[PDB]
Amino acid sequence: HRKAAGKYGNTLEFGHLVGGEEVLEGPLLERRNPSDREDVVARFPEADKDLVRKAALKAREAFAEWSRTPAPIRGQVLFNLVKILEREKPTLTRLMVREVGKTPKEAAGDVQEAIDTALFFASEGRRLYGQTVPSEMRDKELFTFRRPLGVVGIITAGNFPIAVPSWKLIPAVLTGNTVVWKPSEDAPTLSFVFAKLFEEAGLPPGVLNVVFGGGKGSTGQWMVELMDEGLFQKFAFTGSTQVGRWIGEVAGRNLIRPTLELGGKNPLVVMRDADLDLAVEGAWWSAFATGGQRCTSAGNILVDAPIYEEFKRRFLERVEATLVGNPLLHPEVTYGPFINERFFARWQEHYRVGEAEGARLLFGRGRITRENPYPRFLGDPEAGLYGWPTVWEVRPGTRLFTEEVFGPTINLVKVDGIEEAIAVANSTPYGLSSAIYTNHRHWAYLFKVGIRAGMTSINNATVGAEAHLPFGGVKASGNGGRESGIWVLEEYTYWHAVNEEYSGRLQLAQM
Amino acid sequence: AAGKYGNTLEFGHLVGGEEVLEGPLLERRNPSDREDVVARFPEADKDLVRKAALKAREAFAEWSRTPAPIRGQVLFNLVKILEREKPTLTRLMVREVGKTPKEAAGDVQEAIDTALFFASEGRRLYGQTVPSEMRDKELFTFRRPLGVVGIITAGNFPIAVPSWKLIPAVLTGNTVVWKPSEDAPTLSFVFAKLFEEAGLPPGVLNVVFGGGKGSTGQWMVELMDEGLFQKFAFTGSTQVGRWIGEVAGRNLIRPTLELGGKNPLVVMRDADLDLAVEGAWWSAFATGGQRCTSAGNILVDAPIYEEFKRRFLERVEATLVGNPLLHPEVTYGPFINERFFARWQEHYRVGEAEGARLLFGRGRITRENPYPRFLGDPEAGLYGWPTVWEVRPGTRLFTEEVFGPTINLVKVDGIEEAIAVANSTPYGLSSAIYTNHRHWAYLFKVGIRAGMTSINNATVGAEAHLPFGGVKASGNGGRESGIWVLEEYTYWHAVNEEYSGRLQLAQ
Amino acid sequence: HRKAAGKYGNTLEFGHLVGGEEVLEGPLLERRNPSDREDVVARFPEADKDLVRKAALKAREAFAEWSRTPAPIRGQVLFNLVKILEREKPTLTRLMVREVGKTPKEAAGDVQEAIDTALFFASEGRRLYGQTVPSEMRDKELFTFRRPLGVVGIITAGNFPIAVPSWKLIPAVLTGNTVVWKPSEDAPTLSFVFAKLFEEAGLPPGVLNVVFGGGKGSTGQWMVELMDEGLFQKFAFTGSTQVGRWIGEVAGRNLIRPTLELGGKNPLVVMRDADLDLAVEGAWWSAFATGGQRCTSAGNILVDAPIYEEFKRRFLERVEATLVGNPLLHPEVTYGPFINERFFARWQEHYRVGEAEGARLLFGRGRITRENPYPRFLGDPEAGLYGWPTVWEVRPGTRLFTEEVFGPTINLVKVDGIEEAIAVANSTPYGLSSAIYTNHRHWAYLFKVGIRAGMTSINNATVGAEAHLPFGGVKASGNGGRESGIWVLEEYTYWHAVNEEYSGRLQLAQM
Amino acid sequence: AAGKYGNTLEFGHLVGGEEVLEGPLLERRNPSDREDVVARFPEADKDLVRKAALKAREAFAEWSRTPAPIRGQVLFNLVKILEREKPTLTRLMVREVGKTPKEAAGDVQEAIDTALFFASEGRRLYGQTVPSEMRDKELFTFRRPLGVVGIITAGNFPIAVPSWKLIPAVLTGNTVVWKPSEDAPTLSFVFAKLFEEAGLPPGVLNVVFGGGKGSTGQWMVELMDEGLFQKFAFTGSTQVGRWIGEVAGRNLIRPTLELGGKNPLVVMRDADLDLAVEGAWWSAFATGGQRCTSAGNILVDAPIYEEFKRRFLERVEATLVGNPLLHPEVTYGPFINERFFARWQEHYRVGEAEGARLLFGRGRITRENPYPRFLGDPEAGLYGWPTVWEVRPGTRLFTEEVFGPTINLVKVDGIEEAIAVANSTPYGLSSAIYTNHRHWAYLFKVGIRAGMTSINNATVGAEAHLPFGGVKASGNGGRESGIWVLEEYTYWHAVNEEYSGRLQLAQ
């Protein structure tokens, strides 16, 4: 695999993983270190549609023996994976900093979510409870059982390259399904390694198949199209709303219920009675964790009129102190580069859209360069795509207010009272995360039952969901599916209702 | 006006509590006797469905904020009202869709059972308290209503099947727009009025009558593209369901799709033969074979094939058919509508064309083509000869759903072949095996791909408090009835509460 | 049954209900209207031990067919009971005012709890879920089923003569058990009628047997002793801690897990930031609902130092406005008589104990009489035993502070800060109900996780539990059992674990 | 010192993390070979148990406030540590209680499985969110720790059975005082030390060694009368359990009582005979018949009685017995202690006195009374002849638990009689039926009165993630393992939160 020596490590070359075998087939892509594009992390192929087809048929093959492997034994594989992930946590952390450019602290947390998920589902092997149910008839018994769905197609983003895939891969295999996985082209090395750790843990060959490639016009699109050929009994997607709508459509006509974890425009409310320094810290972290490249990153800070001016002042002071830089050379930075050029490009355009609709720019000068330097940048800002922390004031109903923009940007909006804060908080197409900073029980309550969101934080950030709560969104952010904990079991199994007669006669129900 | 076997009712849509007689007039004739006109009613245009959805959005605000236990009290009232009206609804159902008094009473009883189940669900709807990984922090999950639910239903179970959707939908705090089958408009209107009597606020349930394709049904599905529905629920054909799933999917709706079946019933060499014959017979000819769960194929183990066939044909020959309002002792009555009659007529042609062996049945029962155990006048409506084929796996009669009184026999040899043949259909709704060997029941149970399996019982007659639904072409994973339907009409809201006065970073 | 005409209704005479038959056997007791002891409500016999024995054997007989009656059909009986209770609600309300002296409003609520319980368990007939569980072996399946225990002995107090018995009787029969019930001698008529409503609903004869009589030295004691003869597979008790300890002991040696719902000394905290008028109203109602004759009645109001004087002043103003009287002639009163002479006697003594240990009496002059009248009494205070509203100031560690006293009394205690409020709130032998009035999220939280109680109210009274939450106490208030909702199913069933082999070979688990 | 087959360990009590060598010295000798001294250790007096409970009360304050997911991480560490130590614990268990390496490994594996189960339970422990009947109000339930748990355990499953109590007890935030069996002090000490290595804070687990009656066990039970325990959990004899239940009851404690069995195994005329023989044999002689779940009575259907007896005695005759440390291929080794040996000797006398027919067995295996398939020196310890009787229902051998290698055959005629006879014992722990007729398995399953029933499987070998416990004389309703044990170590806290700024009266 070690094809060349790179700058901050080896340049790895590797192929697809199908039925346990490595398949170096298709035109070569490459992944460059986004903190320093001179460092080439990986060269890897684009799987064509026919190879994805073969991966799904290999998955169908392996599913027969895996689904008949007792769930507690399947759980033992995940238990091995906990220990292996634990052993590899420092290595995976360093590789993640290199390949997607998040800080060592955040990368360790990303890996830890996969460890937590592995442990949770390791013992789920001795749970997976169905029901015994009393019949309305004598000499008859009723049962429900959870059954595996079959072959699961999984397509994932690369902003959480270990955590987010683990939310799908782990419960999928634990419930007895087999998997074809198309990872983000932003994190091919991490994905390959994760697959190999599953292998070391004892996952049978072909239960997990990995096909690398792009999205639109590439492997991703081709994999979605294969739902039309009956090769997938389930589909799970993390990514943009735009792509999610199409995947939902294709899934829908093939009578598949897909897991769709899509975008957000996450509101964070600060009421007049908030602990101001706590709220500032929470807003700041909500905005600039991962350089604002989380589904759950804050979109709009809604600030109660009586503290607006004072909150703005302290918020801008806190934003000004943000360290930015190459996190492999400067692990103390708050955030590093854009993960890829797409996020950078859309973020650059948000400045033009903001100016065109009359948003007021309070802070930020676009791309950080030698020519346009940022006072708290550490290292060489031209080796990658890095963004100025960016703060606007905006009105509701504008594009900056309603549309998701990955990258280090945030809006301030003035609201007056709890009723207006809730109405404005709900004035986007999205409904993923949400937060309110307040001390009045009644205000926390009203926000909690008035917001339309999958997730709400009280005196906490829009980011940082605990790994054992149901994760997902409403409105444009999802379709109702949830990941993590017991709530994800509905995504990867179906209910089998069984009635058993012993009465030696035909008894007619409700008659 | 007065009709033949009762009143001819005229009525309109129910929108925001008001009756709206707007649109071209349709009618529903008694399928046992076309001279009896049951109902005249309008076809809602797309714009009126639009208004119904907006009225639903309006009413949802106060209904979702009505405490769940009070919502449950409305359903409790509905139990008592349904109880009171059971004989009336039974008689009207015999008249309007042509099923027997016995089956119609059972249909109504399912709605009563559903009402009672969800009446106390008002004091349940459990979410979770969950321990945080942090000190001074607490985690919660809550079930929240989705919003406005669009419901489209078939008319073969005109009270039961709609109750499976309407009742949990309103109990969980949603509001509803309902497009009932044009085969059962009167029952649907009445059911809506009973909800009203029970105390359901005006606009929480809106009913828009009309057709399906090129009519109210289709227009209602299209309105998902305008953002007017947060949920959609459908009971009907796979072909229509695929389209509804597609439209729902692009609008990020998770729809309930309860679709067709081709339900296998296996009889192993060791079965109680007379029990299995009775079960196969009832699976086939209950409701004249017009259930989603009606048996499609009887798979008979080689050593008892000849003996089972002989007794099965003797039992089929004894089937009484007729107008169930004049002859309530009949096994089944007419086709519910002309579509089922037409597709049933075609199955004979397709059967002959692919070389299936016709053992019994001569198509439509007429004065000229009479059935020996018909009671009454077979030309007052569309009635079908009981029909039995022998078929091969992989053929159209074997794989494709055919509503109406038909069934196939197939010879299998041993449990492994019975399971493989049982799974050789696009469908996966109901299923059954007759056997006494624990090991054979077990292998069928874990080898079949179906939402529902009966051991020594019919493919029909699901109990109202088990999860109902199918896999493959029969559904998308959603389940109705019991606790399992709550996932269909609510979403999970995860809440974390900090008290530690500092920002604690998870994982 | 109509033996004589009484003052406010008929004087009823009736016997025990055993195997469906009425048995007029034993020395006659009588129940006098506690608001007016000239009104004789009922004459009824004391069942001797041998008749209780026969009732248990009749229960054992009926249990065979009842346990084999499908749970959904058993639920239909409870559904009939909902409708019958509904029909009889005005009648049961009036009879309850007459027989135990609570207000029409409270009596209607008492009956409504039985209606709510009936409805809840009516549909529980189609639930009672056990589990399907995956085996660690191939060709093997695991199951759990809830099974009825057998014959349940139930002994109940009379302060909640319909509600509290319904919490036991209804889930007991729904889960397929049969019952012997010894009602309080304070509410024999209500109990007889309730049994007859079960009969009208379709409960088979002998599934519910009712044996009337006393407690110590009488039917109650004899029924507890029959646990030593193997006649009860379950026991459920509502009453005093003193009696509960003995019942727990007898149950314990016979390997029965009893439901024990015992006394309380329920703390209600008012913090400096409380809505004062809300807290005063809540404390007032906690103290004087049912004339302070609830398990959950407030024992001690713990008032934060900065609002102590102001709270006292408003609390005494509110206590002074309390109406007291015969609730059958004056349904607007807050409370009526003591239910029986025992409660009156113990309450009279609490004055002497209070004086002896130096508690400061702020309000109350003992029994209300013509000679010692109460300014807001309505009617004739000598026709029954009525109590002055009573308010003390006490110190922690005293008898008035730690010991339950049924009747209209309450203590004020000064506390300083949340830590002290919690420590003082926990300084009793009891742990049933509890409450805090506050607006600071952090204070509500600390009380909630610091208190040792089965039940906690935030900005609500210690009384008024909703009928579908788990009800019960810790410490001297109970043994861990809970009533109501799904939580009571553990009380009346046992788990049956079943494993089914199909593999035709002996597979050794964990080996 | 060095012993014969390993080190002789000396150690004291573990209280607040410190080792306390205080009290008269006891010793545990290798029951396979009395010359091998495994351990010397003290008898804790009542006052030291008192101190252990107060140290537990102290440590509980910080442990209960440790977030459940962090508590789960300690158990996760324990999984890995138990895994690492499995061969060592296996060898020590063979030495200290005399079970075979295979069974000892399984014993340890149950603790590993329990550890893993409750490791992730740290992120579960679900309570409920519940809808109020009022506006502007919310309802919650939370699981809370009970406090200080007293645990007393037998030594026939010296790692498994204690793990069923210790692990969920600490995971749910309780603290523990543990009095281990004097038959397994070394294993118990080591297990406590592994908890310590895993990161369990000092004083959360305290271990006090000593005897039972007139010793540390009895004194610990008496301390319930001083208010020092909020929970008690016991595994052992019914006679002791009744007393513990009594003491617990007057102190308003709900105790876990896992007591004896007289476990019936039915073989119907249609059973796979060789499977049933193997299952009966293993049910009887696993652990030398020293399991709570060991078969008490084989109930054999009349038509196969003679043939089953013949094959059963052939299988019993092939049983290897011996020192399992020198001969790991043996089926079973010695009696674990002298009490089991004594009660087993008495069962022969009682059997003869009431007229039971002895088919096989000659009492203690000695040089003078040798057993043909004994391996090694039978005088180094207490070893028993495999023993088989024929008995009548209602006799003492039939109804009373007898630890050790003995079993009864009883003739029954038909399923109804098999069930009635199976229930004719004071006990109700485990049970089994061998049959192929679905209807017979069903009737046994719903007719038996037992906590646990096996169909075509042994009375022994319960899987670690099903609820374990008994009815009648075998227990009080409590269950161990899985989610079902959480009721044993927590209590429900119901919380209602008002936001409506006014007093709303319920019902």
Residue numbers in the entry:
A (entry chain A), C (entry chain A): 1 to 511
B (entry chain B), D (entry chain B): 4 to 510
Structure paper excerpt:
Found in both prokaryotes and eukaryotes, aldehyde dehydrogenases (ALDH) (EC 1.2.1.3) constitute a large family of NAD(P)-dependent enzymes with molecular weights of 50–60 kDa. ALDHTt contains an unusually extended C-terminal arm forming novel interactions with the N-terminus in the quaternary structure which interacts closely with the substrate entry tunnel. The ALDHTt monomer is composed of the three domains common to all ALDHs: (i) The NAD(P)+ binding domain (1–125 + 148–261) comprising a Rossman fold, (ii) the catalytic domain (267–458) and (iii) the oligomerization domain (126–147 + 494–501). However, the presence in ALDHTt of an unusual extended arm that wrap the facing monomer through H-bonds and salt bridges shows for the first time how the tetramer is not merely a dimer-of-dimers carrying out their functions independent of each other, but that the interaction of the N- and C-termini in CS-related monomers may regulate active site access in NCS-related molecules.
The co-crystal structure of ALDHTt515 was solved with NADP+ bound in the expected cofactor binding cleft of the monomeric subunit. Comparison of the NADP-bound with apo structures did not reveal significant conformational changes for the adenosine pyrophosphate accommodation within the cofactor binding cleft. The 2′-phosphate group is positioned in the ceiling of the binding cleft with O2 and O3 within 3 Å distance from Glu185 carboxyl group. While these unfavorable contacts could result in electrostatic repulsion, the 2′ phosphate is stabilized by hydrogen bonds with the Glu185 backbone amide group in addition to Ser184 and Lys182 side chains. Despite the co-crystals of the truncated mutant ALDHTt515-NADP+ being significantly larger and better diffracting than those with NAD+, enzyme kinetics data described in this work indicates that the preferential cofactor is NAD+. In addition, these data are supported by the observed proximity of the 2′ phosphate to Glu185, which gives the structural basis for NAD+ preference in ALDHTt. Upon cofactor binding, Glu261 rolls back to make a place for the cofactor, this movement is accompanied by a local 180° flip of the main chain linker loop to bring Leu262 carbonyl group toward the carboxamide nitrogen of the nicotinamide for stabilization.
